[PDB]
Design a protein around this ligand. Structure first.
Ligand SMILES: COc1cccc(NC(=S)N(CCO)Cc2cc3cc(C)c(C)cc3[nH]c2=O)c1
Ligand SMILES: COc1cccc(NC(=S)N(CCO)Cc2cc3cc(C)c(C)cc3[nH]c2=O)c1
Lengths: 603, 603
């Protein structure tokens, strides 16, 4: 369906993020049968929203729980909301939600990183209290967007396994809200900026609408009406403009009016005049040779999970700004939109990514019981549904982020195994369909190191080359000397194979803060520094390398294992954001360069 | 004025603690000259509210700033608020804050820890958008609670100095909000709960109204009307009751209605039926001797400073519940009211404390010779004005917290130097005023160890003896054998001197997580364990000891010096809430006792 980011004019919100809700586990899965949502959850306790449920209670049994949990809370609908449109919206519900307003089932959602909403006017009465009950599921299976497998034990209980690193946080991770609309209402919008050698340029509106006529007006930074359009379906305004750029990120505001003889609906959609596409081995934003810096990130932090948080947000960006990141990627799931609004506002370049992670079964590291399906693409394991579920996941992200100028690229998935058979048959359609959803931006699929330049059957189908590489770490462990060869050899081997522009979307080594070594070896701070030094030395000797993003901005939490010391320790910063000695090395390189500019194959 | 906590009944909030606001320093002190409230702030970066401002940007220069800062933000008055009393309320602005609505100054408050609100209807238009500038100031002086001394070097660069441990974090630490009432509205309520060997009793009630007749009903847990009342400023209700009790804190709800001829107002006040009194050396709750366990805590966490936060609150409360703590003291300043609602609901016992720490010029770190007034109680230093600003701090605190059944006593100050004559001159009238302000709870003043049983001049004026003791650590360093003899001799001296109940409100040692030692000496986890254990042996020998609150729940940021290794490490938990091994020691001692009940002098 249609997603529009709420803002506040002929519409206003009660955020329900007001944190404390009633909470409970349903270890018997008797909750739907016993119709829990008709009265107050019993045996509950306070929980905060937004945040993951897992770590709020310091309890392993809750942390590793799998199945359904219940959220409940009450809330007076504002008196002024008349006969108006009342709309309940969740920015995310991690993995799956079902919603009961008093007794009315109003909503259902699968996907954990994108919004869903419903018109609730008929079971609500403005000026009165209404119960809100949410049922939340955190289970993953094969047609799910990260896939996974729930093993039920003989003894009654579930237990989740899956194929990615990062830990399976679940819950209401983002803002909920009740919001208000006129019965005339904008409900969809799309916008495209074309650029021309940097002198002048044009933007297209298209806009689905609740019944009404659209006056479309584009405003200055200073609110001077410099673009006007008529029509409820389409326009193009060719004004000679001020562009969205990386150092600075200028933005226009396109108000959107939908009219009836009774009503009016007014919408400001921030807009960045920017063009994105690839030319040969170059990446082009406003027809310029960019160079990417920054990291893969996660939504992870002590206590809250992947739960959204303003302070955290403000601090991390301060940190990225300081250290010279111009860009980052939404590692392995759609992030809360606020990050993107900030990126636009601040001109930060974003490779936007779907939750399609862990399609891979070789990854890995198993001393344990094998199964585990034999064929990756099978009706058993990655199947028809799964391509369809996956398709739907790509719609939504694009539905949400097409209008965010900061997004210069889409990412279809991260590290799928492309050595098994259906791997090109699975990936070709979605690659086509992606561009049929948005042809304004290039599209990639992020590449695991064992589908290497001679074995990977999928890369031509995409526009840019996104590599995750560990050459001294998982292989050649500890050996910078031979690691540098393999890496360059393999970067050159990609350059000729595909003659595409190359970005390393993951390069990094586990490092324990405070571990220091005169022998400069694995897990030491010094080693991280030497290893990043080297990867760097090597992108300076390759023309096709136009992007660099460090494995992890900060240490995050993982599934429990032998290869993870209390989590992934590959952060430049610790989880509480204290900088490892490598923050200061990246500091120099990233602020020493010219903005958006590769070195002189040296410096 | 009158302070009631906003809730949603006829009443309605729009949170606006939506926390993205604009922000900047004022280094040359131009802000009030150039009427900054009049135009949108310039050179202004995004900051999260609520939060301390110091830590969100990873910048030492902002962190250590002294002077004025500005928060600015536009908002929408709900169209629905038509005939409405519209109030702008700030839960806290740390130290002083001045507020403009669009070139209309509406407020000013001095105090960093309690709310201030203004009726703003005539400066706002329902359904339009407003600009709100706050000027916040973080400086301390001899008349501020707490006190301090700004030092300006030869260059005019201000530098704050103060006499307490914890870091002077400042900013808007708690929510801001626009909220609604009718022009007939309850603006103050007061409840006193009485009880007699526990079978049934009454609640006196006093109710101040904005223009109306008042009526009153006591609704049950399951919402049934257990009693009724009429009259305005006076009533009393009798009941066969489930008392509010340390374990569980059962709550009735008192329902206040102010009626005009035209307009109507409704206010729910949670009521816990319980009595609190000292009887000799015992502290009685519902007529039963109670024994406190638990912490002095702070408002502190990474990134957000003293900024309030829901996930953090739910997590620390799971921790204290797990560990067996039945109480705490709002060390050092009034805490977020949310903290007290939680206490109310879960039956946590609280010692509520003003921000009056630092009265002492004798807790210096060493050897920066200068230079501080030589007479503590003098016109230069702690003078008639200070005593006024102190009395004010007491009033504001009690006005806020008087109906919180979780509050069982008021602490007026922490570790004042009571040796200098005039200490008694300064505190006697404060002791007196406080009792008059609330006659329903015991009163205390927390005692610093070098004011000892033979030198202290103030403790006879208060009801309960609360001692901060550090034998083995600041004095007799490392020597448990002799620390233990001195602790016991001193506690016995106090018992015989005053025959009051003794709560040790601070005892703890700095412990670096992960420093382990076979010698069981000073900064190791093993010492923290052995030291608390020695303290425990002595408490169980002394019959007037009626409570124990370990000094720190968690490590916290302090100002820099040679005694604080990046903060106070007397934490039981680290700042990121990881348990030190003393956590399991306390857990065993506190969950092993009978709930609320002093041990039998034995294991
Ligand atoms: C199931 O969730 C988990 C749990 C714990 C660890 C991981 N590891 C992950 S995601 N990575 C991918 C790094 O981008 C490390 C990894 C690299 C790797 C490289 C090669 C060349 C081979 C042959 C096998 C490999 N196996 C691996 O595990 C995943
Ligand atoms: C960062 O804020 C700062 C800065 C500088 C110093 C401190 N120190 C603090 S708060 N204390 C805590 C006292 O509860 C240690 C202390 C103990 C003490 C004991 C005796 C028996 C005597 C005679 C003198 C003493 N003086 C002290 O200072 C804190």
């Amino acid at each position: 369906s249609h997603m529009l980011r709420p803002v506040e004019t002929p519409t206003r919100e009660i955020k329900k993020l007001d944190g404390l809700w009633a909470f409970s586990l349903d270890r018997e899965n008797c909750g739907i049968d016993q119709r829990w949502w008709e009265s107050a959850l019993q045996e509950s306790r306070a929980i905060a929203v937004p945040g993951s449920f897992n770590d709020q209670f310091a309890d392993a049994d809750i942390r590793n729980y799998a199945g359904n949990v219940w959220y409940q809370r009450e809330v007076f609908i504002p008196k002024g909301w008349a006969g108006q449109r009342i709309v309940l919206r969740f920015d995310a519900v991690t993995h799956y939600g079902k919603v009961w307003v008093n007794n009315q089932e109003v909503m259902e959602h699968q996907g954990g990183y994108t919004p869903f909403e419903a018109d609730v006017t008929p079971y609500v009465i403005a000026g009165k209290s209404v119960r809100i009950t949410v049922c939340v599921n955190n289970e993953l299976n094969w047609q799910t967007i990260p896939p996974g497998m729930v093993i039920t034990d003989e003894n009654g209980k579930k237990k989740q396994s899956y194929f990615h690193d990062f830990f399976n946080y679940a819950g209401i991770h983002r803002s909920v809200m009740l919001y208000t609309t006129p019965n005339t209402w904008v409900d969809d919008i799309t916008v495209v900026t074309h650029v021309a050698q940097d002198c002048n340029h044009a933007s297209v509106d298209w806009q689905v609408v609740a019944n009404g006529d659209v006056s479309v007006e584009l405003r200055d930074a200073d609110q001077q009406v410099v673009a006007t359009g008529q029509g409820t379906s389409g326009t193009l305004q060719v004004v000679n403009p001020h562009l969205w750029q990386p150092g600075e990120g200028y933005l226009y505001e396109l108000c959107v009016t939908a009219k009836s003889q009774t009503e009016c609906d007014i919408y400001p959609l921030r807009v960045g005049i920017r063009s994105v596409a690839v030319k040969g081995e170059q990446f082009l934003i406003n027809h310029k040779p960019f160079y990417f810096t920054g990291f893969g990130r996660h939504e992870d932090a002590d206590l809250r999970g992947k739960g959204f948080d303003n302070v955290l947000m403000v601090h991390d960006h301060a940190l990225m700004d300081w250290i010279g990141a111009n860009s980052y990627r939404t590692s392995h799931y759609p992030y809360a939109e606020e990050m993107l609004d900030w990126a636009d506002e601040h001109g930060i370049v974003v490779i936007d990514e779907t939750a399609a992670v862990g399609f891979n079964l070789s990854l890995g590291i198993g001393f344990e019981a094998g199964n585990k399906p034999k064929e990756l693409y099978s009706e058993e394991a990655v199947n028809g549904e799964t391509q369809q579920a996956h398709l739907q996941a790509i719609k939504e992200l694009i539905a949400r982020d097409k209008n965010h100028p900061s997004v210069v690229m889409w990412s279809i998935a991260n590290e799928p195994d492309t050595r098994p058979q259906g791997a090109r048959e699975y990936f070709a359609p979605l690659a086509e369909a992606t561009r049929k959803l948005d042809p304004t931006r290039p599209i990639t699929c992020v590449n695991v190191m064992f589908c290497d330049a001679h074995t990977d059957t999928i890369s031509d189908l995409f526009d840019v080359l996104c590599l995750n590489r560990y050459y001294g770490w998982y292989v050649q462990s500890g050996d910078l000397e031979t690691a540098e060869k393999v890496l360059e050899k393999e970067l050159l081997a990609w350059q000729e194979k595909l003659h595409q522009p190359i970005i390393i979307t993951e390069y990094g080594v586990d490092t324990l803060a405070g571990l220091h070594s005169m022998y400069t070896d694995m897990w030491s701070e010094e080693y991280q520094c030497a290893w990043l030094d080297m990867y760097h030395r090597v992108f300076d000797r390759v023309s096709a390398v136009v992007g660099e993003q460090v494995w992890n901005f900060a240490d995050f939490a993982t599934s429990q294992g032998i290869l993870r010391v209390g989590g992934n320790k590959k952060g430049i910063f610790t989880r509480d954001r204290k900088p490892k000695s490598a923050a200061f090395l990246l500091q120099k390189r990233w602020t020493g360069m010219n903005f958006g500019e590769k070195p002189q194959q040296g410096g």
